[PDB]
Design a protein around this nucleic acid. Structure first.
Lengths: 407, 200
DNA sequence: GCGTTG
DNA sequence: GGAAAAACGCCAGCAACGC
RNA sequence: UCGUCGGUUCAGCGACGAUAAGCCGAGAAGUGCCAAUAAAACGUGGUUUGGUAACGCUCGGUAAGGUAGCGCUGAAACUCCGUGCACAAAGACCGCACGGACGCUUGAGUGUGAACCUGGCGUUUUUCCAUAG
């Protein structure tokens, strides 16, 4: 597996902040140039190869026309003249990302289902894993030394070695960095990113790690239902334990940003929109934090009951997902967090068809549309089953092949 | 100079399977001309590479692209093909500096493409019975001598309520029909007609 | 340790 | 209609050799 | 009430700012506006150049924690005490380690609480206004 942790850059060691910021903005401009020109050169090679097969009879060899096995090798040779300030391994990784995205999606681009990808202004800075080195000092500082410049750029900017910055390593980042420095974790290709709200630069480190091996019974399954009266309900077949998440904080935040959006010149488009994007980024960050909390609770309640399989709904064909509690949520974000945290815990996630799953009684299996009589309570007809509707739904999810059993 | 769309229920002298096949063929040629005009605008503006030039009586990129494209895009009407190639070349010329600077990649065009229609190829008519006929000149002569479509394609358009004020001033003489498009909606499977109109 | 190409 | 925003969706997260 | 700093996100707490849903610059890529000039394509069509500053025109500025003064001493941000190590202005310093005492969570972990897999690209609808039934 591989995860990402960010660290705040305090200051460069031998530079000033003004020179360091100028260098970072210039390398951002060069990264954006390299991405967009590698996309243009890959598109031009696609068109040339189509015209070559039309005029000759076969596809042209890239090694004969361009001089290179890959179009990445030609794009490096072209882009390297105007992107001379980037470190050449970082430039090679950037062009590799651009040409790999164009190569993986070439049939979708030729069919017209996907656009040709354009790249934006505030772009992250790539760093291959040989260009990162972190060291802890005796007085408690952490120095990250980064190869960011080429050999001409180091001479034109009067830099002699790698650029060393001080990073803050606190909290869980202390644990990650201590496992990096002892060899237990392995650094992958990483980023320099920027945060406009706090005006902060970050080293975004991608690390390879081997997760903890547990013993979990694959035959025990936990079912998760997106309730209409509580937010998430979790149930089991082999045990009458039931867990739930209700949104008290969700209901509070949902009208504390609705009571604030009741009231809501001549200097461009970026004014007249600056105070509303604060509220929008606040809402996005709240949803991200809430989905992380919910995902950790759902995977923790499956570690607790020894389950080796998680089953939840499939939301691609519902279209009335606004009738649930959460009500407009980022459900895809929550489910992806469920998936990676369960894969890290050792649990299989199986999405199932939510065919009816709320009219079926979960004790015998009779499906009647008049079963739920007020959106919180559940009454059966064939066995007189008395239950909560979300718990009955979550217990119907936890059956191993319930989507074939219903239909 | 504003737009109003009008949903098409049916063609008069055709069924919804012949007319749909004709529109999908026209969409394929429209997308071909849009992509090829972007390639030829890339070649015309310099911009290319060494490996292509190491391998003309035209004033502008529009004429060179038109005379190159019109052989393979022969099923489209000639004014409609000219209006399509103008859209692609003007999109390339409005974005040429960012394409050169590397602030943008190549302009691209989607599969469910609109079909262009110059104002010489759009007609509307009310009768005494109450329906609304839109007459559309969509094919060329080598296409009309092969699909055996005899006249302009006449379809019935839903003109209700808000657009009914818009259409009548078209038939009065007060509004002038500008260049329009035939568009498609995939989720509804619904063909619309984006009539553009003028007022001064 | 950067640079170039598979 | 216009002009944007946001939910949904997918995948990566280089390697080997030469100066 | 909204915001700034206290490692990241959400909340709290401490200290601050606020007419900040404010105030001001420069510039000219675009939508207008004003001048001329008018190609490709089939009379229709709308071309090319310059100016102008109205613009959800373009690029930016503008408030917000605290810190010891004679080459040594060591002050100051989210519990206290001790011993070390490091530090004279700071977008950059207010930290780190070990030992203990007090708590907290479930003998360990912990020190305000919970959490901490991101980045890039694409798609398609939904908002929000304007508009008319």
């Amino acid at each position: 597996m591989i995860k990402v942790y960010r660290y705040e850059i305090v200051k460069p060691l031998d530079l000033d902040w003004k020179e360091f910021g100028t260098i970072l903005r210039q390398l951002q401009q060069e990264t954006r140039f390299a991405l967009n020109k590698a996309t243009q050169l890959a598109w031009e090679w696609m068109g040339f190869s189509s015209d070559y097969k039309d005029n000759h009879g076969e596809y042209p060899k890239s090694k004969d026309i361009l001089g290179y096995t890959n179009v990445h090798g030609y794009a490096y040779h072209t882009i390297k003249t105007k992107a001379y300030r980037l470190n050449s391994g970082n430039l090679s990784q950037t062009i590799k990302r651009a040409t790999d995205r164009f190569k993986a999606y070439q049939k979708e681009i030729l069919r017209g289902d996907m656009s040709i990808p354009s790249y934006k202004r505030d772009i992250p800075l790539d760093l291959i894993k040989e260009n990162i080195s972190v060291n802890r000092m005796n007085h408690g500082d952490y120095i990250a030394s980064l190869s960011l410049l080429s050999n001409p750029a180091k001479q034109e900017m009067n830099v002699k070695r790698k650029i060393s910055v001080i990073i803050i390593v606190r909290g869980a980042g202390k644990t990650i960095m201590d496992r990096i420095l002892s060899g237990e974790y392995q650094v992958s290709a990483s980023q320099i990113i920027h945060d406009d709200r706090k005006n902060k630069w970050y080293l975004n480190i991608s690390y390879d790690f081997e997760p903890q091996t547990r013993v979990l019974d694959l035959n025990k399954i936990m079912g998760i239902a997106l309730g209409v009266a509580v937010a998430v309900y979790m149930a089991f077949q082999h045990t009458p334990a039931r867990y739930k998440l209700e949104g008290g904080e969700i209901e509070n935040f949902r009208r504390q940003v609705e009571s604030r959006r009741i009231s809501m010149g001549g200097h461009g488009r970026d004014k007249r929109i600056k105070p509303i994007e604060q509220l929008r980024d606040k809402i996005a960050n709240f949803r991200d934090t809430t989905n992380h909390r919910y995902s950790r609770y759902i995977v923790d309640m499956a570690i607790k009951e020894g389950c080796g399989t998680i089953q939840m709904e499939d939301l691609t064909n519902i279209r009335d997902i606004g009738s649930r509690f959460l009500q407009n949520w980022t459900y895809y974000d929550l489910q992806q967090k469920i998936i990676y945290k369960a894969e890290e815990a050792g649990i299989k996630v199986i999405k199932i068809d939510p065919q009816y799953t709320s009219q079926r009684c979960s004790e015998c299996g009779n499906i009647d549309s008049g079963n739920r009589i007020g959106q919180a309570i559940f009454k059966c007809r064939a066995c007189g089953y008395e239950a909560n509707a979300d718990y009955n739904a979550a217990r119907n999810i936890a059956i191993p092949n319930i989507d074939k059993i219903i239909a | 100079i504003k737009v109003y769309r009008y949903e098409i229920v049916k063609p008069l002298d055709l069924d919804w399977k012949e007319f749909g096949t004709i529109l999908r063929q026209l969409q394929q040629e429209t997308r071909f001309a849009l992509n090829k005009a972007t390639q030829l605008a890339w070649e015309w503006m310099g911009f290319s590479s060494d490996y292509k030039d190491n391998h003309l009586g035209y004033t502008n990129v529009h004429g060179y692209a038109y005379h190159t494209i019109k052989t393979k895009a022969y099923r489209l009407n000639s004014g409609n093909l000219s209006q399509t190639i103008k859209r692609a070349t003007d999109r390339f010329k409005a974005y040429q500096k960012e394409i050169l600077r590397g602030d943008m990649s190549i302009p691209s065009y989607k599969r469910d493409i609109p079909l262009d229609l110059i104002k010489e190829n759009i007609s509307v008519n009310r009768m005494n019975h109450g329906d609304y006929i839109a007459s559309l000149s969509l094919l060329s002569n080598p296409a009309k001598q092969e699909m055996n479509v005899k006249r302009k394609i006449s379809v019935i358009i839903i003109v209700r309520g808000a657009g009914k004020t818009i259409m009548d001033r078209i038939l009065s003489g007060e509004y002038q029909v500008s260049a329009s498009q035939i568009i498609h909606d995939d989720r509804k499977n619904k063909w619309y007609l984006n009539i553009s109109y003028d007022f001064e």
